[PDB]
Amino acid sequence: SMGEAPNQALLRILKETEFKKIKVLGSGAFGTVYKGLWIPEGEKVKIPVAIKELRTSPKANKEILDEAYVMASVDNPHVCRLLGICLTSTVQLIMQLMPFGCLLDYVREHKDNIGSQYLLNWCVQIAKGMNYLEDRRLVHRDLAARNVLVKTPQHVKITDFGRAKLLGKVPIKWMALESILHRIYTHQSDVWSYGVTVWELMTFGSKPYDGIPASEISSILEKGERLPQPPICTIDVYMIMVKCWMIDADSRPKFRELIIEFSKMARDPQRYLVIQGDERMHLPSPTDDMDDVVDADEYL
Numbered sequence: 001s002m003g004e005a006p007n008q009a010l011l012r013i014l015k016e017t018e019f020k021k022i023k024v025l026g027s028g029a030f031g032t033v034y035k036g037l038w039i040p041e042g043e044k045v046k047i048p049v050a051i052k053e054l055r056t057s058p059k060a061n062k063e064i065l066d067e068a069y070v071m072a073s074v075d076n077p078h079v080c081r082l083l084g085i086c087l088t089s090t091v092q093l094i095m096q097l098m099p100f101g102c103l104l105d106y107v108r109e110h111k112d113n114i115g116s117q118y119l120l121n122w123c124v125q126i127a128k129g130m131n132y133l134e135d136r137r138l139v140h141r142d143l144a145a146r147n148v149l150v151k152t153p154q155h156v157k158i159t160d161f162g163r164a165k166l167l168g169k170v171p172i173k174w175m176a177l178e179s180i181l182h183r184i185y186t187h188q189s190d191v192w193s194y195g196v197t198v199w200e201l202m203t204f205g206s207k208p209y210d211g212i213p214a215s216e217i218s219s220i221l222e223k224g225e226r227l228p229q230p231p232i233c234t235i236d237v238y239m240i241m242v243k244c245w246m247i248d249a250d251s252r253p254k255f256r257e258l259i260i261e262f263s264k265m266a267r268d269p270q271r272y273l274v275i276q277g278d279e280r281m282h283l284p285s286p287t288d289d290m291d292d293v294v295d296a297d298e299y300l
């Protein structure tokens with residue numbers, strides 16, 4: 001082809017009778033998500049699923065199918081994928097169930113049991129998920145802790161491709177300055193958002209710029225104010241957030257560099273995050289010289 005490569009992803013159409021809704025998991029601007037079970041008729045398999053419907057219009061149906069397009073076209077361990085769609089009167093996106101919910105709610109709920117190893121590994125995994133999106137020439141445009149989901153406490157994935165695009169109400173407090181002032185979105189504007197996301201996690205789910213209305217945020221950033229250093233953050237970790245929030249986009253880190261930096265820190269978590277009572281902390285499992293060293297799997 002002359003331009004971008006052909007997108008040969010498979011959109012799978014699934015029958016209504018192949019799956020069942022069990023209960024509602026949540027509602028909001030993202031839509032309405034149900035817990036369910038998908039049982040492909042031929043095979044002896046049962047697959048836990050999240051089923052998204054909007055809370056119908058021809059406009060609503062366009063937007064939701066644009067989202068399904070993008071979700072069907074991704075394939076990465078730290079990115080939520082579309083299993084299929086069901087074409088009843090209400091269009092339904094069938095997705096992989098993320099049992100522990102969104103990471104923002106998780107950090108708030110399990111604050112007293114989250115240690116530095118988990119926090120840093122989450123940062124790595126999100127950076128990997130985002131770096132994969134960058135490799136696919138795809139800008140998320142809505143990265144936040146509310147859009148990172150928890151498969152297990154050890155494994156998180158990025159989701160919510162409703163604003164996602166190739167290279168209403170908007171998430172002003174997670175957006176780069178240039179996006180606010182000029183609607184410019186790049187991979188490096190996603191980095192700003194990663195910065196904010198990390199701050200959310202390191203503060204155990206604090207609202208950024210809490211009390212400040214969104215219309216004042218642009219002039220605050222112009223003046224040079226940024227989100228403050230969380231109590232548990234070493235200067236090492238805060239410095240990385242601060243780089244994500246530079247005026248010059250190219251001066252911010254690349255996602256591949258963040259994978260490297262956080263993975264180095266993840267080898268010795270207590271050097272980089274100071275948490276009272278750390279590593280006496282337990283979270284549920286499925287079974288329930290050396291400073292600059294980086295494993296090749298993290299060096300892309």
Ligand SMILES: O=C1Nc2nc3ccccc3n2CCCCCOc2ccccc2-c2cc1ccn2
Binds near residue numbers: 030147159
């Ligand atoms: O498993 C998914 N959700 C889900 N599991 C839960 C378990 C416990 C309690 C609540 C739970 N929730 C609700 C979270 C909804 C907000 C974020 O989710 C999305 C927002 C936009 C588009 C897609 C998705 C999405 C959601 C799930 C899986 C793949 N994608």
